[PDB]
Amino acid sequence: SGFRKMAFPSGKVEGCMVQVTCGTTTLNGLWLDDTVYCPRHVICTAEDMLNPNYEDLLIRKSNHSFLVQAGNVQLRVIGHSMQNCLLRLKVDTSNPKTPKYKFVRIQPGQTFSVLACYNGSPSGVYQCAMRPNHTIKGSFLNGSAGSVGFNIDYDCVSFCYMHHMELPTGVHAGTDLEGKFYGPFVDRQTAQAAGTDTTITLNVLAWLYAAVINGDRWFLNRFTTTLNDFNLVAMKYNYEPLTQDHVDILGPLSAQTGIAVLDMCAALKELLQNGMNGRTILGSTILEDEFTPFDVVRQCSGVTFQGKFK
Amino acid sequence: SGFRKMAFPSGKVEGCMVQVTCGTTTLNGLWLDDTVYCPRHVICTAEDMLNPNYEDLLIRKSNHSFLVQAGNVQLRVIGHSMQNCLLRLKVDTSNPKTPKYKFVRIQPGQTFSVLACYNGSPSGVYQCAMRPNHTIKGSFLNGSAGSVGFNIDYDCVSFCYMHHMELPTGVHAGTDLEGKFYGPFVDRQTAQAAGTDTTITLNVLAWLYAAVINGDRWFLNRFTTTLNDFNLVAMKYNYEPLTQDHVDILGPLSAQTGIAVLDMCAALKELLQNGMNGRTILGSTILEDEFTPFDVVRQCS
């Protein structure tokens, strides 16, 4: 029992974090096999960020302009290139601690764990989701660029995110591990902004099921609605349109709670336009949307009674 | 910017988790040096986990009765003994991944990271606070016993918790790494229930300071209070009494924001007697009490 935002154990990722210095700029790098991946703006001074010319800026660099520290072993960069918005640094030493890994591009609404690093030293870990506007709501200070996001499946770490920068609203932007940003963002000093941040309706619903299993059922006192009637209300509070596929995904949770989906949307309808009236749902006053259906079932598994109900 | 419950990186603990099977019962253990620490009810069966006699139960068992696995590597048990509610198994090898470590007994109000494991395989990491009624609001399934709570001070793992029992209300109970339970609980299926919890006043104030650091200033007002006037308001709202040591611990956040601690207590006192009235604090209408002053600092620089 219990329901908590849970991150993946970070050990396999820690063994890959290194510090990367160029000139007077430092940030973090990802050391896999003989390659160190890091955000390309490590080759920049603060004044360069306004209109950097990365190719020209990098042409000026030699292998020995790049300084890579792994714990204390100094690696030797023996090659370098730019791939989209990342540098790939070839090092002499192949990381003995490399895990099985994939480079994947995560989709909005899915979750991942973040290993926040400073000076190449892991400092903390937490769970977040790729937002529909292609930002994430992280916790990053200066020097955190190069920290990575990841999901672990069996013994394989699948890396989805590398951190680059902060938007004025305090949310964060970065790239996949090929160097391609999520969203419209670019690694130069310019006015950029997160779009209309919508709310991952599928996750809110998944979360509402988690509340029922953990004893919260007060909000369930409405009669079934329809998808069109639910979608209509969900328009102005910026909730993504509910779809049949989303309903199918929640089928296991409806079956375990005995609470049909369109019955749970009846409750969500009420919650959105009239609020919570000062109560709480799983200790929260806000509708949580960074738990996927997968996430909620992993923590809320159950038992199937095999009489035949209605 | 940004502010979230974040746990410590768990790799140093992941390298110490092992699997301990004693009959048909499996839970996790902690392998430091040549010793595997694990909850002693691994030796019970369901019939035993009623009212067991451990020293009795233990006498029948011998070394070969303990299957201990670090991954696929089976370890051979070279001895065994009970220390309070833990077993200590002596084994062939000093764990090569034994980090610098120490055992600590945490106090109510403090937080730690939990590495939830199953069959000796780590599966999740999240942040917890020791409640004043000495329980934990964790997330634990069957076979999570032996999972550990820890903090990390640079390269030293401080182990403060090992998981044993789930209580009726769904909150959790366990021991320090010497096997003494936090709180009055026992590793017996007997009637026992968490006492009435209270709110961790020091951590609510830390959280209001984190709010200020992250923009929210509306609740700041203009009065002050002594400790006494504050505590008389707080007692009413089920809050822990605030001591002068608590005030001192809040110095750095007070200095870094410019709000005197007893000024922040006047702000809090008002929020309890008046409510928030449609306004939010870090987006919430409820007062969070599971961040310590240290957790806020570590994250707000």
Side-chain angles (χ1 to χ4, degrees), chain A residues 1 4 7 9-11 14 123-125 127 137 139-140 166 285 290 298-299, chain B residues 1-2 4-5 7 10-11 14 125 127 137 139-140 166 170 290 298-299:
Chain A
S1 69
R4 283 227 182 222
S10 58
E14 295 167 55
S123 49
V125 56
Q127 170 93 348
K137 324 188 120 182
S139 190
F140 294 110
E166 186 165 308
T285 68
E290 301 210 336
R298 144 170 150 123
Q299 264 168 280
Chain B
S1 328
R4 299 165 140 266
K5 263 157 155 271
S10 58
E14 279 156 65
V125 62
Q127 199 78 345
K137 308 188 169 206
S139 173
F140 285 134
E166 184 170 86
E290 289 224 339
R298 173 195 159 209
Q299 187 165 169

PDB file of all heavy atoms in Angstrom, chain A residues 1 4 7 9-11 14 123-125 127 137 139-140 166 285 290 298-299, chain B residues 1-2 4-5 7 10-11 14 125 127 137 139-140 166 170 290 298-299:
ATOM      1  N   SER A   1       0.818  -1.192   0.000  1.00  0.00           N
ATOM      2  CA  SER A   1       0.000   0.000   0.000  1.00  0.00           C
ATOM      3  C   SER A   1       0.852   1.241   0.000  1.00  0.00           C
ATOM      4  O   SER A   1       2.024   1.186   0.326  1.00  0.00           O
ATOM      5  CB  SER A   1      -0.931   0.018   1.210  1.00  0.00           C
ATOM      6  OG  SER A   1      -0.205   0.204   2.409  1.00  0.00           O
ATOM      7  N   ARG A   4       3.179   6.888  -4.294  1.00  0.00           N
ATOM      8  CA  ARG A   4       4.242   7.884  -4.292  1.00  0.00           C
ATOM      9  C   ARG A   4       4.808   8.073  -5.697  1.00  0.00           C
ATOM     10  O   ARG A   4       4.901   7.126  -6.481  1.00  0.00           O
ATOM     11  CB  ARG A   4       5.348   7.491  -3.296  1.00  0.00           C
ATOM     12  CG  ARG A   4       4.970   7.763  -1.845  1.00  0.00           C
ATOM     13  CD  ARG A   4       6.126   8.472  -1.158  1.00  0.00           C
ATOM     14  NE  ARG A   4       5.918   8.751   0.266  1.00  0.00           N
ATOM     15  CZ  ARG A   4       6.265   9.904   0.843  1.00  0.00           C
ATOM     16  NH1 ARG A   4       6.812  10.857   0.086  1.00  0.00           N
ATOM     17  NH2 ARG A   4       6.067  10.124   2.156  1.00  0.00           N
ATOM     18  N   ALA A   7      10.994   7.355  -8.659  1.00  0.00           N
ATOM     19  CA  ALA A   7      11.939   7.359  -9.764  1.00  0.00           C
ATOM     20  C   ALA A   7      12.654   6.018  -9.851  1.00  0.00           C
ATOM     21  O   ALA A   7      12.677   5.242  -8.896  1.00  0.00           O
ATOM     22  CB  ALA A   7      12.975   8.479  -9.611  1.00  0.00           C
ATOM     23  N   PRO A   9      15.885   3.595  -9.890  1.00  0.00           N
ATOM     24  CA  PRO A   9      17.165   3.648  -9.175  1.00  0.00           C
ATOM     25  C   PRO A   9      18.255   4.090 -10.133  1.00  0.00           C
ATOM     26  O   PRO A   9      18.353   3.583 -11.244  1.00  0.00           O
ATOM     27  CB  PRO A   9      17.368   2.208  -8.688  1.00  0.00           C
ATOM     28  CG  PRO A   9      16.386   1.372  -9.443  1.00  0.00           C
ATOM     29  CD  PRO A   9      15.232   2.280  -9.767  1.00  0.00           C
ATOM     30  N   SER A  10      19.067   5.056  -9.704  1.00  0.00           N
ATOM     31  CA  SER A  10      19.906   5.809 -10.630  1.00  0.00           C
ATOM     32  C   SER A  10      21.298   5.228 -10.829  1.00  0.00           C
ATOM     33  O   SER A  10      22.037   5.747 -11.668  1.00  0.00           O
ATOM     34  CB  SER A  10      20.034   7.242 -10.147  1.00  0.00           C
ATOM     35  OG  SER A  10      20.573   7.277  -8.847  1.00  0.00           O
ATOM     36  N   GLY A  11      21.643   4.145 -10.119  1.00  0.00           N
ATOM     37  CA  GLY A  11      23.014   3.640 -10.123  1.00  0.00           C
ATOM     38  C   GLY A  11      23.620   3.452 -11.498  1.00  0.00           C
ATOM     39  O   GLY A  11      24.758   3.857 -11.748  1.00  0.00           O
ATOM     40  N   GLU A  14      24.558   6.873 -12.907  1.00  0.00           N
ATOM     41  CA  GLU A  14      25.632   7.562 -12.194  1.00  0.00           C
ATOM     42  C   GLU A  14      26.992   7.172 -12.754  1.00  0.00           C
ATOM     43  O   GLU A  14      27.823   8.033 -13.042  1.00  0.00           O
ATOM     44  CB  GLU A  14      25.569   7.260 -10.695  1.00  0.00           C
ATOM     45  CG  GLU A  14      24.336   7.794  -9.988  1.00  0.00           C
ATOM     46  CD  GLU A  14      24.158   7.225  -8.592  1.00  0.00           C
ATOM     47  OE1 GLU A  14      25.092   7.335  -7.802  1.00  0.00           O
ATOM     48  OE2 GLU A  14      23.091   6.658  -8.272  1.00  0.00           O
ATOM     49  N   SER A 123      23.659  14.566  -7.982  1.00  0.00           N
ATOM     50  CA  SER A 123      23.200  15.161  -6.739  1.00  0.00           C
ATOM     51  C   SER A 123      21.800  14.743  -6.315  1.00  0.00           C
ATOM     52  O   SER A 123      21.493  14.822  -5.127  1.00  0.00           O
ATOM     53  CB  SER A 123      23.268  16.697  -6.834  1.00  0.00           C
ATOM     54  OG  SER A 123      22.656  17.122  -8.028  1.00  0.00           O
ATOM     55  N   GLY A 124      20.943  14.300  -7.226  1.00  0.00           N
ATOM     56  CA  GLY A 124      19.604  13.899  -6.818  1.00  0.00           C
ATOM     57  C   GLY A 124      18.797  13.385  -7.987  1.00  0.00           C
ATOM     58  O   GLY A 124      19.147  13.591  -9.156  1.00  0.00           O
ATOM     59  N   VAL A 125      17.693  12.698  -7.650  1.00  0.00           N
ATOM     60  CA  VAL A 125      16.891  11.991  -8.643  1.00  0.00           C
ATOM     61  C   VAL A 125      15.399  12.170  -8.353  1.00  0.00           C
ATOM     62  O   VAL A 125      14.963  12.246  -7.195  1.00  0.00           O
ATOM     63  CB  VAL A 125      17.307  10.495  -8.714  1.00  0.00           C
ATOM     64  CG1 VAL A 125      17.210   9.837  -7.376  1.00  0.00           C
ATOM     65  CG2 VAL A 125      16.488   9.744  -9.719  1.00  0.00           C
ATOM     66  N   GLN A 127      11.200  12.196 -10.594  1.00  0.00           N
ATOM     67  CA  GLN A 127      10.411  11.642 -11.678  1.00  0.00           C
ATOM     68  C   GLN A 127       9.640  12.780 -12.318  1.00  0.00           C
ATOM     69  O   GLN A 127       9.079  13.622 -11.614  1.00  0.00           O
ATOM     70  CB  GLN A 127       9.481  10.554 -11.130  1.00  0.00           C
ATOM     71  CG  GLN A 127       8.444  10.041 -12.075  1.00  0.00           C
ATOM     72  CD  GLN A 127       8.889   8.814 -12.839  1.00  0.00           C
ATOM     73  OE1 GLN A 127      10.070   8.456 -12.829  1.00  0.00           O
ATOM     74  NE2 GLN A 127       7.940   8.145 -13.499  1.00  0.00           N
ATOM     75  N   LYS A 137       8.880  20.057 -16.175  1.00  0.00           N
ATOM     76  CA  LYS A 137       8.912  20.881 -14.969  1.00  0.00           C
ATOM     77  C   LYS A 137       9.916  20.256 -14.011  1.00  0.00           C
ATOM     78  O   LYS A 137       9.583  19.516 -13.087  1.00  0.00           O
ATOM     79  CB  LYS A 137       7.509  21.073 -14.365  1.00  0.00           C
ATOM     80  CG  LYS A 137       6.419  21.193 -15.436  1.00  0.00           C
ATOM     81  CD  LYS A 137       5.054  21.578 -14.906  1.00  0.00           C
ATOM     82  CE  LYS A 137       4.611  22.888 -15.554  1.00  0.00           C
ATOM     83  NZ  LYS A 137       3.293  23.341 -15.026  1.00  0.00           N
ATOM     84  N   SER A 139      13.818  20.446 -11.733  1.00  0.00           N
ATOM     85  CA  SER A 139      14.464  21.200 -10.658  1.00  0.00           C
ATOM     86  C   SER A 139      15.951  21.225 -11.008  1.00  0.00           C
ATOM     87  O   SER A 139      16.666  20.241 -10.770  1.00  0.00           O
ATOM     88  CB  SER A 139      14.205  20.571  -9.292  1.00  0.00           C
ATOM     89  OG  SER A 139      14.612  21.396  -8.211  1.00  0.00           O
ATOM     90  N   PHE A 140      16.396  22.339 -11.603  1.00  0.00           N
ATOM     91  CA  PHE A 140      17.745  22.504 -12.137  1.00  0.00           C
ATOM     92  C   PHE A 140      18.300  23.867 -11.730  1.00  0.00           C
ATOM     93  O   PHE A 140      17.616  24.897 -11.877  1.00  0.00           O
ATOM     94  CB  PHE A 140      17.768  22.416 -13.671  1.00  0.00           C
ATOM     95  CG  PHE A 140      17.414  21.058 -14.246  1.00  0.00           C
ATOM     96  CD1 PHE A 140      16.209  20.870 -14.920  1.00  0.00           C
ATOM     97  CD2 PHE A 140      18.304  19.992 -14.165  1.00  0.00           C
ATOM     98  CE1 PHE A 140      15.889  19.640 -15.472  1.00  0.00           C
ATOM     99  CE2 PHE A 140      17.995  18.751 -14.726  1.00  0.00           C
ATOM    100  CZ  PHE A 140      16.794  18.566 -15.368  1.00  0.00           C
ATOM    101  N   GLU A 166      16.727  26.787 -19.182  1.00  0.00           N
ATOM    102  CA  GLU A 166      15.523  27.159 -18.440  1.00  0.00           C
ATOM    103  C   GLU A 166      14.767  28.289 -19.151  1.00  0.00           C
ATOM    104  O   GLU A 166      15.374  29.281 -19.563  1.00  0.00           O
ATOM    105  CB  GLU A 166      15.902  27.576 -17.006  1.00  0.00           C
ATOM    106  CG  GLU A 166      14.723  27.840 -16.124  1.00  0.00           C
ATOM    107  CD  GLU A 166      15.056  27.885 -14.656  1.00  0.00           C
ATOM    108  OE1 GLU A 166      15.686  26.945 -14.151  1.00  0.00           O
ATOM    109  OE2 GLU A 166      14.667  28.863 -13.983  1.00  0.00           O
ATOM    110  N   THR A 285      -4.226  18.790  -3.360  1.00  0.00           N
ATOM    111  CA  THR A 285      -5.255  19.760  -3.685  1.00  0.00           C
ATOM    112  C   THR A 285      -5.308  20.072  -5.176  1.00  0.00           C
ATOM    113  O   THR A 285      -6.193  20.813  -5.609  1.00  0.00           O
ATOM    114  CB  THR A 285      -5.027  21.050  -2.885  1.00  0.00           C
ATOM    115  OG1 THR A 285      -3.831  21.719  -3.333  1.00  0.00           O
ATOM    116  CG2 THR A 285      -4.902  20.721  -1.420  1.00  0.00           C
ATOM    117  N   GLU A 290       1.253  13.646 -13.679  1.00  0.00           N
ATOM    118  CA  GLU A 290       2.532  13.058 -14.072  1.00  0.00           C
ATOM    119  C   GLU A 290       2.662  11.601 -13.634  1.00  0.00           C
ATOM    120  O   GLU A 290       3.773  11.090 -13.441  1.00  0.00           O
ATOM    121  CB  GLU A 290       3.686  13.914 -13.549  1.00  0.00           C
ATOM    122  CG  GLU A 290       3.583  15.321 -14.107  1.00  0.00           C
ATOM    123  CD  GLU A 290       4.923  16.036 -14.291  1.00  0.00           C
ATOM    124  OE1 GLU A 290       5.900  15.687 -13.601  1.00  0.00           O
ATOM    125  OE2 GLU A 290       4.992  16.948 -15.144  1.00  0.00           O
ATOM    126  N   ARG A 298       1.565  -0.185 -11.638  1.00  0.00           N
ATOM    127  CA  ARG A 298       2.746  -0.771 -11.020  1.00  0.00           C
ATOM    128  C   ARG A 298       2.679  -0.672  -9.499  1.00  0.00           C
ATOM    129  O   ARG A 298       3.155  -1.572  -8.796  1.00  0.00           O
ATOM    130  CB  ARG A 298       4.010  -0.106 -11.619  1.00  0.00           C
ATOM    131  CG  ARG A 298       5.221   0.135 -10.725  1.00  0.00           C
ATOM    132  CD  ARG A 298       6.415   0.575 -11.609  1.00  0.00           C
ATOM    133  NE  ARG A 298       7.386   1.478 -10.969  1.00  0.00           N
ATOM    134  CZ  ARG A 298       8.695   1.227 -10.856  1.00  0.00           C
ATOM    135  NH1 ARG A 298       9.179   0.070 -11.321  1.00  0.00           N
ATOM    136  NH2 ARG A 298       9.522   2.121 -10.273  1.00  0.00           N
ATOM    137  N   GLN A 299       2.025   0.360  -8.970  1.00  0.00           N
ATOM    138  CA  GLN A 299       1.971   0.559  -7.531  1.00  0.00           C
ATOM    139  C   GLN A 299       0.671   0.097  -6.914  1.00  0.00           C
ATOM    140  O   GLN A 299       0.632  -0.129  -5.698  1.00  0.00           O
ATOM    141  CB  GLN A 299       2.149   2.030  -7.190  1.00  0.00           C
ATOM    142  CG  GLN A 299       3.547   2.408  -6.832  1.00  0.00           C
ATOM    143  CD  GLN A 299       3.721   3.896  -6.800  1.00  0.00           C
ATOM    144  OE1 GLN A 299       3.883   4.544  -7.844  1.00  0.00           O
ATOM    145  NE2 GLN A 299       3.665   4.463  -5.605  1.00  0.00           N
TER     146      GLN A 299
ATOM    147  N   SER B   1      15.623  26.902 -11.180  1.00  0.00           N
ATOM    148  CA  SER B   1      14.341  27.015 -10.511  1.00  0.00           C
ATOM    149  C   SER B   1      13.673  25.663 -10.525  1.00  0.00           C
ATOM    150  O   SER B   1      14.180  24.707 -11.111  1.00  0.00           O
ATOM    151  CB  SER B   1      13.404  28.025 -11.198  1.00  0.00           C
ATOM    152  OG  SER B   1      14.087  29.113 -11.813  1.00  0.00           O
ATOM    153  N   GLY B   2      12.486  25.611  -9.957  1.00  0.00           N
ATOM    154  CA  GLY B   2      11.760  24.369  -9.832  1.00  0.00           C
ATOM    155  C   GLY B   2      11.972  23.795  -8.455  1.00  0.00           C
ATOM    156  O   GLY B   2      12.983  24.058  -7.789  1.00  0.00           O
ATOM    157  N   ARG B   4      10.898  20.117  -6.166  1.00  0.00           N
ATOM    158  CA  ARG B   4      10.311  18.790  -6.184  1.00  0.00           C
ATOM    159  C   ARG B   4      10.915  17.964  -5.065  1.00  0.00           C
ATOM    160  O   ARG B   4      12.049  18.198  -4.635  1.00  0.00           O
ATOM    161  CB  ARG B   4      10.570  18.059  -7.503  1.00  0.00           C
ATOM    162  CG  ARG B   4      10.017  18.722  -8.684  1.00  0.00           C
ATOM    163  CD  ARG B   4      10.626  18.155  -9.914  1.00  0.00           C
ATOM    164  NE  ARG B   4       9.561  18.033 -10.892  1.00  0.00           N
ATOM    165  CZ  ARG B   4       8.854  16.933 -11.076  1.00  0.00           C
ATOM    166  NH1 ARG B   4       9.129  15.859 -10.359  1.00  0.00           N
ATOM    167  NH2 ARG B   4       7.896  16.922 -11.990  1.00  0.00           N
ATOM    168  N   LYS B   5      10.150  16.972  -4.614  1.00  0.00           N
ATOM    169  CA  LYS B   5      10.721  15.947  -3.750  1.00  0.00           C
ATOM    170  C   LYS B   5      11.772  15.205  -4.569  1.00  0.00           C
ATOM    171  O   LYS B   5      11.458  14.582  -5.583  1.00  0.00           O
ATOM    172  CB  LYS B   5       9.626  15.020  -3.212  1.00  0.00           C
ATOM    173  CG  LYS B   5       9.133  15.413  -1.782  1.00  0.00           C
ATOM    174  CD  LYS B   5       7.715  14.921  -1.388  1.00  0.00           C
ATOM    175  CE  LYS B   5       7.560  14.797   0.173  1.00  0.00           C
ATOM    176  NZ  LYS B   5       7.946  13.409   0.885  1.00  0.00           N
ATOM    177  N   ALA B   7      15.064  12.485  -4.308  1.00  0.00           N
ATOM    178  CA  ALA B   7      15.828  11.539  -3.524  1.00  0.00           C
ATOM    179  C   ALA B   7      17.301  11.676  -3.863  1.00  0.00           C
ATOM    180  O   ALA B   7      17.668  12.261  -4.885  1.00  0.00           O
ATOM    181  CB  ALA B   7      15.337  10.124  -3.818  1.00  0.00           C
ATOM    182  N   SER B  10      20.949   6.637  -5.816  1.00  0.00           N
ATOM    183  CA  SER B  10      20.885   5.399  -5.060  1.00  0.00           C
ATOM    184  C   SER B  10      21.967   4.371  -5.411  1.00  0.00           C
ATOM    185  O   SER B  10      21.997   3.303  -4.792  1.00  0.00           O
ATOM    186  CB  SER B  10      19.508   4.766  -5.249  1.00  0.00           C
ATOM    187  OG  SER B  10      19.274   4.542  -6.620  1.00  0.00           O
ATOM    188  N   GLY B  11      22.868   4.659  -6.354  1.00  0.00           N
ATOM    189  CA  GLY B  11      23.814   3.635  -6.801  1.00  0.00           C
ATOM    190  C   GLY B  11      24.657   3.024  -5.689  1.00  0.00           C
ATOM    191  O   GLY B  11      24.910   1.817  -5.678  1.00  0.00           O
ATOM    192  N   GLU B  14      22.316   0.609  -4.169  1.00  0.00           N
ATOM    193  CA  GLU B  14      22.032  -0.486  -5.093  1.00  0.00           C
ATOM    194  C   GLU B  14      23.108  -1.562  -5.032  1.00  0.00           C
ATOM    195  O   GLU B  14      22.801  -2.761  -5.074  1.00  0.00           O
ATOM    196  CB  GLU B  14      21.907   0.034  -6.522  1.00  0.00           C
ATOM    197  CG  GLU B  14      20.579   0.644  -6.857  1.00  0.00           C
ATOM    198  CD  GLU B  14      20.672   1.647  -8.014  1.00  0.00           C
ATOM    199  OE1 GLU B  14      20.983   1.231  -9.150  1.00  0.00           O
ATOM    200  OE2 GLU B  14      20.445   2.858  -7.784  1.00  0.00           O
ATOM    201  N   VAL B 125      13.021   4.516  -6.196  1.00  0.00           N
ATOM    202  CA  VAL B 125      13.588   5.400  -5.177  1.00  0.00           C
ATOM    203  C   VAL B 125      12.681   6.624  -4.997  1.00  0.00           C
ATOM    204  O   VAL B 125      12.213   7.222  -5.969  1.00  0.00           O
ATOM    205  CB  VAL B 125      15.023   5.832  -5.537  1.00  0.00           C
ATOM    206  CG1 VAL B 125      15.039   6.616  -6.825  1.00  0.00           C
ATOM    207  CG2 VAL B 125      15.596   6.694  -4.428  1.00  0.00           C
ATOM    208  N   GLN B 127      11.389   9.825  -1.757  1.00  0.00           N
ATOM    209  CA  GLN B 127      11.687  10.554  -0.530  1.00  0.00           C
ATOM    210  C   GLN B 127      10.616  10.334   0.528  1.00  0.00           C
ATOM    211  O   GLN B 127       9.430  10.321   0.227  1.00  0.00           O
ATOM    212  CB  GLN B 127      11.800  12.046  -0.840  1.00  0.00           C
ATOM    213  CG  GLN B 127      12.520  12.809   0.178  1.00  0.00           C
ATOM    214  CD  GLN B 127      14.031  12.648   0.080  1.00  0.00           C
ATOM    215  OE1 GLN B 127      14.555  11.746  -0.598  1.00  0.00           O
ATOM    216  NE2 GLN B 127      14.744  13.511   0.794  1.00  0.00           N
ATOM    217  N   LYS B 137       5.134   7.122   5.459  1.00  0.00           N
ATOM    218  CA  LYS B 137       4.145   7.023   4.386  1.00  0.00           C
ATOM    219  C   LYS B 137       4.886   6.624   3.118  1.00  0.00           C
ATOM    220  O   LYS B 137       5.141   7.428   2.221  1.00  0.00           O
ATOM    221  CB  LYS B 137       3.375   8.329   4.223  1.00  0.00           C
ATOM    222  CG  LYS B 137       2.780   8.823   5.544  1.00  0.00           C
ATOM    223  CD  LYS B 137       1.837  10.027   5.403  1.00  0.00           C
ATOM    224  CE  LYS B 137       1.073  10.282   6.739  1.00  0.00           C
ATOM    225  NZ  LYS B 137      -0.273  10.975   6.571  1.00  0.00           N
ATOM    226  N   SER B 139       5.676   3.473  -0.034  1.00  0.00           N
ATOM    227  CA  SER B 139       4.984   2.787  -1.118  1.00  0.00           C
ATOM    228  C   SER B 139       5.680   1.440  -1.218  1.00  0.00           C
ATOM    229  O   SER B 139       6.754   1.345  -1.816  1.00  0.00           O
ATOM    230  CB  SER B 139       5.073   3.567  -2.423  1.00  0.00           C
ATOM    231  OG  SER B 139       4.551   2.842  -3.529  1.00  0.00           O
ATOM    232  N   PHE B 140       5.072   0.417  -0.623  1.00  0.00           N
ATOM    233  CA  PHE B 140       5.701  -0.876  -0.396  1.00  0.00           C
ATOM    234  C   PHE B 140       4.741  -2.005  -0.732  1.00  0.00           C
ATOM    235  O   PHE B 140       3.603  -2.027  -0.255  1.00  0.00           O
ATOM    236  CB  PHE B 140       6.113  -1.022   1.057  1.00  0.00           C
ATOM    237  CG  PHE B 140       7.326  -0.246   1.432  1.00  0.00           C
ATOM    238  CD1 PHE B 140       7.342   0.504   2.602  1.00  0.00           C
ATOM    239  CD2 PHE B 140       8.469  -0.296   0.653  1.00  0.00           C
ATOM    240  CE1 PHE B 140       8.466   1.221   2.978  1.00  0.00           C
ATOM    241  CE2 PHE B 140       9.624   0.423   1.031  1.00  0.00           C
ATOM    242  CZ  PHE B 140       9.615   1.179   2.195  1.00  0.00           C
ATOM    243  N   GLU B 166       3.910  -3.375   7.432  1.00  0.00           N
ATOM    244  CA  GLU B 166       2.842  -2.451   7.081  1.00  0.00           C
ATOM    245  C   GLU B 166       1.772  -2.508   8.164  1.00  0.00           C
ATOM    246  O   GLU B 166       1.350  -3.592   8.561  1.00  0.00           O
ATOM    247  CB  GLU B 166       2.269  -2.806   5.709  1.00  0.00           C
ATOM    248  CG  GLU B 166       1.209  -1.866   5.176  1.00  0.00           C
ATOM    249  CD  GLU B 166       0.909  -2.184   3.715  1.00  0.00           C
ATOM    250  OE1 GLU B 166       0.051  -3.072   3.447  1.00  0.00           O
ATOM    251  OE2 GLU B 166       1.571  -1.570   2.835  1.00  0.00           O
ATOM    252  N   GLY B 170      -2.161   1.411   6.487  1.00  0.00           N
ATOM    253  CA  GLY B 170      -1.360   1.432   5.278  1.00  0.00           C
ATOM    254  C   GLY B 170      -0.034   2.181   5.366  1.00  0.00           C
ATOM    255  O   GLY B 170       0.706   2.210   4.367  1.00  0.00           O
ATOM    256  N   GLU B 290       6.878  17.747   4.574  1.00  0.00           N
ATOM    257  CA  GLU B 290       7.859  16.676   4.400  1.00  0.00           C
ATOM    258  C   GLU B 290       9.137  17.132   3.702  1.00  0.00           C
ATOM    259  O   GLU B 290       9.843  16.294   3.146  1.00  0.00           O
ATOM    260  CB  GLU B 290       7.243  15.490   3.650  1.00  0.00           C
ATOM    261  CG  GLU B 290       6.211  14.715   4.493  1.00  0.00           C
ATOM    262  CD  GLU B 290       6.346  13.167   4.400  1.00  0.00           C
ATOM    263  OE1 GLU B 290       6.947  12.674   3.422  1.00  0.00           O
ATOM    264  OE2 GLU B 290       5.833  12.451   5.302  1.00  0.00           O
ATOM    265  N   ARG B 298      19.638  22.403   0.047  1.00  0.00           N
ATOM    266  CA  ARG B 298      20.291  21.527  -0.914  1.00  0.00           C
ATOM    267  C   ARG B 298      19.774  21.757  -2.330  1.00  0.00           C
ATOM    268  O   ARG B 298      20.504  21.524  -3.299  1.00  0.00           O
ATOM    269  CB  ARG B 298      20.075  20.084  -0.457  1.00  0.00           C
ATOM    270  CG  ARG B 298      20.531  18.985  -1.395  1.00  0.00           C
ATOM    271  CD  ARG B 298      19.940  17.623  -0.991  1.00  0.00           C
ATOM    272  NE  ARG B 298      19.952  16.706  -2.126  1.00  0.00           N
ATOM    273  CZ  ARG B 298      19.081  15.709  -2.312  1.00  0.00           C
ATOM    274  NH1 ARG B 298      18.097  15.480  -1.429  1.00  0.00           N
ATOM    275  NH2 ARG B 298      19.192  14.942  -3.398  1.00  0.00           N
ATOM    276  N   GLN B 299      18.547  22.276  -2.467  1.00  0.00           N
ATOM    277  CA  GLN B 299      17.872  22.433  -3.750  1.00  0.00           C
ATOM    278  C   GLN B 299      17.676  23.889  -4.173  1.00  0.00           C
ATOM    279  O   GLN B 299      17.325  24.136  -5.330  1.00  0.00           O
ATOM    280  CB  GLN B 299      16.506  21.699  -3.685  1.00  0.00           C
ATOM    281  CG  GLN B 299      15.691  21.583  -4.986  1.00  0.00           C
ATOM    282  CD  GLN B 299      14.550  20.535  -4.917  1.00  0.00           C
ATOM    283  OE1 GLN B 299      13.702  20.486  -5.792  1.00  0.00           O
ATOM    284  NE2 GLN B 299      14.548  19.709  -3.889  1.00  0.00           N
TER     285      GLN B 299
END
